[PDB]
Amino acid sequence: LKNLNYSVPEEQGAGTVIGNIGRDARLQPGSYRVLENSAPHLLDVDADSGLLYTKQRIDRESLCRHNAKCQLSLEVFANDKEICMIKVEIQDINDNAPSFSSDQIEMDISENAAPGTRFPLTSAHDPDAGENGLRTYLLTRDDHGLFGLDVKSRGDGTKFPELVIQKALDREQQNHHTLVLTALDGGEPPRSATVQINVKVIDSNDNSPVFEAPSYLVELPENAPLGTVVIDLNATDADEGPNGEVLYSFSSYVPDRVRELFSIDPKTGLIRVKGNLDYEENGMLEIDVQARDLGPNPIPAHCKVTVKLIDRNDNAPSIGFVSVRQGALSEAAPPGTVIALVRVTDRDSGKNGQLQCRVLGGSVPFKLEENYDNFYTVVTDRPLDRETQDEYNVTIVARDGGSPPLNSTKSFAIKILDHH
Amino acid sequence: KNLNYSVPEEQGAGTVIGNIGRDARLQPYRVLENSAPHLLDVDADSGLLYTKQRIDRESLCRHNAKCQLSLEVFANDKEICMIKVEIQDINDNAPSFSSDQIEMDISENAAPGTRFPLTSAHDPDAGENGLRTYLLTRDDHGLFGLDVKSRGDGTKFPELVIQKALDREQQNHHTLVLTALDGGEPPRSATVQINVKVIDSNDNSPVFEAPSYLVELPENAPLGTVVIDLNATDADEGPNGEVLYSFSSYVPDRVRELFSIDPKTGLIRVKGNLDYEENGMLEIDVQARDLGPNPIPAHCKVTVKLIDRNDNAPSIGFVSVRQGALSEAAPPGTVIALVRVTDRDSGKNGQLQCRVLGGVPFKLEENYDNFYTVVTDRPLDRETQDEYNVTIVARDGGSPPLNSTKSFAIKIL
Ligand SMILES: *[C@@H]1O[C@H](CO[C@@H]2O[C@@H](C)[C@@H](O)[C@@H](O)[C@@H]2O)[C@@H](O[C@@H]2O[C@H](CO)[C@@H](O[C@@H]3O[C@H](CO[C@H]4O[C@H](CO)[C@@H](O)[C@H](O)[C@@H]4O)[C@@H](O)[C@H](O)[C@@H]3O)[C@H](O)[C@H]2NC(C)=O)[C@H](O)[C@H]1NC(C)=O
Ligand SMILES: *[C@@H]1O[C@H](CO[C@@H]2O[C@@H](C)[C@@H](O)[C@@H](O)[C@@H]2O)[C@@H](O[C@@H]2O[C@H](CO)[C@@H](O)[C@H](O)[C@H]2NC(C)=O)[C@H](O)[C@H]1NC(C)=O
Ligand SMILES: *[C@@H]1O[C@H](CO[C@@H]2O[C@@H](C)[C@@H](O)[C@@H](O)[C@@H]2O)[C@@H](O[C@@H]2O[C@H](CO)[C@@H](O)[C@H](O)[C@H]2NC(C)=O)[C@H](O)[C@H]1NC(C)=O
Ligand SMILES: *[C@@H]1O[C@H](CO)[C@@H](O[C@@H]2O[C@H](CO)[C@@H](O)[C@H](O)[C@H]2NC(C)=O)[C@H](O)[C@H]1NC(C)=O
Ligand SMILES: *[C@@H]1O[C@H](CO)[C@@H](O)[C@H](O)[C@H]1NC(C)=O
Ligand SMILES: *[C@@H]1O[C@H](CO)[C@@H](O)[C@H](O)[C@H]1NC(C)=O
Ligand SMILES: *[C@H]1O[C@H](CO)[C@@H](O)[C@H](O)[C@@H]1O
Ligand SMILES: *[C@H]1O[C@H](CO)[C@@H](O)[C@H](O)[C@@H]1O
Ligand SMILES: *[C@H]1O[C@H](CO)[C@@H](O)[C@H](O)[C@@H]1O
Ligand SMILES: *[C@H]1O[C@H](CO)[C@@H](O)[C@H](O)[C@@H]1O
Ligand SMILES: [Ca+2]
Ligand SMILES: [Ca+2]
Ligand SMILES: [Ca+2]
Ligand SMILES: [Ca+2]
Ligand SMILES: [Ca+2]
Ligand SMILES: [Ca+2]
Ligand SMILES: [Ca+2]
Ligand SMILES: [Ca+2]
Ligand SMILES: [Ca+2]
Ligand SMILES: [Ca+2]
Ligand SMILES: [Ca+2]
Ligand SMILES: [Ca+2]
Ligand SMILES: [Ca+2]
Ligand SMILES: [Ca+2]
Ligand SMILES: [Ca+2]
Ligand SMILES: [Ca+2]
Ligand SMILES: [Ca+2]
Ligand SMILES: [Ca+2]
Ligand SMILES: [Ca+2]
Ligand SMILES: [Ca+2]
C-alpha cells in the first residue's frame, strides 16, 4: 500500500514519462496492472516496466477550465499483492494571453456627453487559471487625459472596463479620436492584448449663427428700379449638417410696408428691392433680418440693415392762389397795391425743393414779394399812368433748384379802369 | 464510534438530544471535556444527552452555515465516546431596519432614472432564512420604483428610482413604504416608511392677469395719479415665486420720465405732466421676473390713451401787413394784410372763430385753412380818422373757451 503524488506542467509531449511507480513506491522488482483511472485516454502504465506515461497532450484549460486545483486519479496494482494510489496534478502555465473579440471597435459619442458619463467596452478573456488570468485593463489616452477608464469586477472575479469622459468633448475642436485599450494578465511573462477604440464625436447644435456685423447702413436712390440689390448678408454656423444650415427671414417686427418694399431670399440672404422707394414717403427704413440654423432647438440671430434713401428732384413746384383781386385796378393805384396772394411748394427736400419765383415780364408792372415760408404777395410795380395797358395776362413762374431743375407756371388776368 | 447528532435551535429546556448508551453500544457516564457546559449535559446513570438551556444558533455561530458543538464523555470500564452535535437554523428572526421611518429631500428637478440610497435591512438568520429581497409600495400611480443590487458577499441593498418626473406644484410630499423579505418557509418581513419632501425648482414663470391693458388719462394729470396696478403671479415657492416688476429694456426714456412703477406692488403712477399735444398715447412695456436663479421673465403692455383738454389759447401771426399807409380812395376790399390763426389743441378746443375790432373799416375774410385776409370794409371818406389801430380777435371753441388778440397800425396817405 503506497500513495504517490505527482505534479506535471500542461502541454506535455505525447508519450512523456511522468513517473516510475516501481522505483518511486519501492516495490518488486514486475506486473503493474491498472485497477481504475480518471482518464484512460490520457494516462497509462506499461505493464512490465511500471512507468506512468502520458497518452496524449494535456491542455489544462481544456480539462479543468479555471479550476485552481486540477487532479487526475489512478489506481494501480503491483507485482504480488501490493496496491498503489497515484494522483497527479496538472499545473497551469501561462500559455494563453487575454483576447478581445476584435482589434478595433467604433462608437458614436455626442459632444454633448456630460463629464463623468461612462460607456460600455468589450471585455477580454484569458482561459488561464489563477495568477495567469486577467489582471486589469489600461488605457493609452493620447489627448492629455480627455478619456479615462473605469474597471469593475463581476461575481466570478473577472473584470470588465468602461470608458469615462473626464472632461467635456467638443466636435468643432476635434472631430474624431482614437485611443487604445489593453488587457493585461498576471504571470511572470505578462501577456497583453490591445484594441483600438475609434470614437466618432457627434455634433450637437451648440453654435449660433453669426452675422458678419450686427448692423449695416445702405444708401439707395429714391424710386430705385425694381430688383436693385440692397445687400447680401452672410451668417455662419460652425455646426454640422442642418445644425449648421442657416435660414434667413424677415424679423417678426419688421412692418408690413417694409415687407412690401423688400425681398430677402431665404437661403442666399440677399435683400433686393420689391417696390418704389419714395423719399417723400419715408426718409429711411429699417430691415431687421434674423438667421436660424435648421437643427433642433434652433438658435436665432438678429441683424439690422438701415436703408437710407437719397432724395432726387422728382417733384415739380406747385402754385396755388389763396386769393386774387378781380379785374378792376385803378389807374392811379399806388405802387405796391396788392393784387393777389399765392403759395408755391415743392415736396422735395434740399436744393431740389429750393424755389425761386418771378413774373413773366416784371415788361409788365407787377412784383412778387415773398413774405412767409412759401408765401408771396404779387403787388403793383409802378404807377399805372405812363405805361398803361388795357388788360394784363399776368403769369407766375416757379423754378426749383434741382439737377436738372423743374419749373411750373400759372396765370391770372387783371384789367385797368382806364378811360372814363 | 463517534456519535453525530443534529438538532434545531431554540429547543425546549431539558429536551432529550440523544442516547449515548444505545447509540455507542456501551454499558450504564461521566463528562470529561465538552464544548458547552451550560447547554448540554449527560445523565450519569442513564447515558442520555439532554439540553440544559435553550440554544440560539444566532448567538453561537452568527451566519455560519455549519454550527457544531463537541462533547467528550466516558462510561464504565474506560469506554471513551466522542459526541458531536450540529445546531440547525430556524427562521426565528425577521429582517430589521435601523428605524421605522426615513425622510428624504428630493427636488422636483430630479432627472428620470436617477437613483437614491436607502437604508438596508439585516436578518441574523443563516442561509435561506436571511434577507431575500426588498419590495416597494408606491401608491401614487407608480411614481417611484425600486432597484435591488447585490454586494460582494451576496447581501442585497435597495435604492429608489425616479421612473418619471416629479412636480412639487402638483404634490408637495410623498410617503411610500419599503419592505424587506427574507427566505424561509415562514416568510418574515419588515417595513420602513420613506417620507420624501419634494423640493421646489424654479419651473414656473410669472403670469400677468392679462397680457395687455388700455388706460385713458386726462392730459396734464396731477402728479402721482394712479395709472394701473399690475398683478403677476408665480406658482413657485420662496424667492422662486417672488414677483419683481420693472420697466422693459426697450421703453423710451421719455416714458421713464413720465411714469413710475413700484418694483414690489406693480403700481404705475404719473411722474410728469402728460401733454396731449406732445403725444396722444404712450406704451408702457412692463416686465415681471421671479427672484430665483435663471429667472423667467414675463412681459405686459399698458397703453396710456390721453384725453385732450383746451390748454392752448389761439395764436395770431401776421404774414404780411403791406405799408403803414393806405390810399385815401382805396376801393372796398383792398387787401391790407394777411394773417394766420392757429390752435395747438384738437377738436372743438382747436376750432377757431376770428373777427376785427370794428365792422372801423376792415373785414376779415378767411381764404384757406387757417388763413384770413384783412381787407378794407367800404369806401374811405367821410371819417375823422388818419391812422387806425386795428386789433384782431381769435376765439377757440373750448370749455371754457379761450381768446387772444393782436393789434397793428395803418395810416391813410
Ligand atoms: C458675403 O459673402 C460674399 C462671398 O464670400 C466672399 O468670397 C470670397 C470673396 C472670399 O475671399 C471672402 O472674402 C468672401 O466671404 C462676399 O463677396 C461678395 O460676393 C458677391 C458674389 O459674387 C460679389 O458680387 C459680384 O459683384 C461683381 C461686381 O463687382 C462690383 O464691385 C466692384 C468694386 O468696386 C466694382 O468695381 C464693379 O464695377 C462692381 O460694381 C460682379 O462682377 C459679380 O458677378 C458678382 O455680382 C460681391 O461684390 C462681393 N461683395 C461685395 C461687397 O461686393 C461679400 O463680401 C459678403 N457680403 C458682404 C455684404 O460683405
Ligand atoms: C391687482 O390687485 C389689486 C388688489 O388685489 C385684490 O386683493 C383682494 C383684496 C381681492 O380683492 C383680490 O380679488 C384682488 O387680487 C386690485 O385692486 C382691487 O381690484 C378689485 C377688483 O375686483 C376692486 O374691487 C378693488 O377696489 C381694488 N382695490 C383694492 C382691493 O384695494 C387690482 O385691480 C388688480 N389689478 C388688476 C390689473 O386686476
Ligand atoms: C390798440 O388797441 C388795443 C385795445 O385797446 C382798447 O381796447 C378797448 C378798451 C377799446 O376801447 C378799444 O377802442 C381800444 O383800442 C390795445 O391793446 C390792449 O390795450 C389794453 C388797454 O386798453 C392793454 O391793457 C392790453 O395790454 C393791450 N393788449 C392786449 C393784447 O390786450 C393796443 O395797445 C392799442 N395800440 C396798439 C398800437 O396796438
Ligand atoms: C377772453 O376774453 C374774456 C372777455 O372777452 C377775458 O375775460 C376776462 O378775464 C379776466 C382775467 O384775465 C377776468 O378777471 C374778467 O372777469 C374777464 N372779463 C370778462 C368780460 O369776461 C379773458 O381775459 C380773455 N382771455 C385772454 C387769454 O385774454
Ligand atoms: C396768358 O399767358 C399764358 C402763357 O403765355 C397763356 O398760356 C395763356 O393762354 C394766356 N391767356 C390768354 C387769355 O391768352
Ligand atoms: C418754364 O416751363 C416752360 C414749360 O412750357 C418752359 O417752356 C420754359 O422754358 C421754362 N422756363 C424756365 C426758366 O425754366
Ligand atoms: C502588451 O504588452 C506586451 C509587453 O509585455 C507587448 O508585447 C504586447 O504587444 C502588448 O502591448
Ligand atoms: C494595440 O497594439 C497592437 C500591437 O501589438 C495592435 O496590433 C493593435 O491594433 C492595437 O493598436
Ligand atoms: C411582510 O410579509 C408578511 C407576510 O409574509 C406580512 O404578514 C407582513 O405584514 C409584511 O407585510
Ligand atoms: C410597515 O409596517 C410597520 C409596522 O410594523 C410600520 O413602521 C410602517 O408604517 C409600515 O406600515
Ligand atoms: Ca493550455
Ligand atoms: Ca494568461
Ligand atoms: Ca494555461
Ligand atoms: Ca461644440
Ligand atoms: Ca456643435
Ligand atoms: Ca448651429
Ligand atoms: Ca449670402
Ligand atoms: Ca419721390
Ligand atoms: Ca424727391
Ligand atoms: Ca423739386
Ligand atoms: Ca435563534
Ligand atoms: Ca430571517
Ligand atoms: Ca435563527
Ligand atoms: Ca414644478
Ligand atoms: Ca416649481
Ligand atoms: Ca400689484
Ligand atoms: Ca418661478
Ligand atoms: Ca397740453
Ligand atoms: Ca390740449
Ligand atoms: Ca384751444
Swiss-Prot record, chain A:
Q: Which residues lie toward the Extracellular compartment?
A: 1-418
Q: Which residues are glycosylated?
A: 5, 234, 393, 407
Cadherin domain residues: 1-100, 101-211, 212-319, 321-418
Top-level division of the source organism's lineage: Eukaryota
Indicate which residues form the motif Cell attachment site: 154-156
The subcellular location is:
Cell membrane
Task: Give a short account of what the protein does.
Answer: Potential calcium-dependent cell-adhesion protein.
Q: What is this protein called?
A: Protocadherin-17
Q: Which organism is it from?
A: Homo sapiens
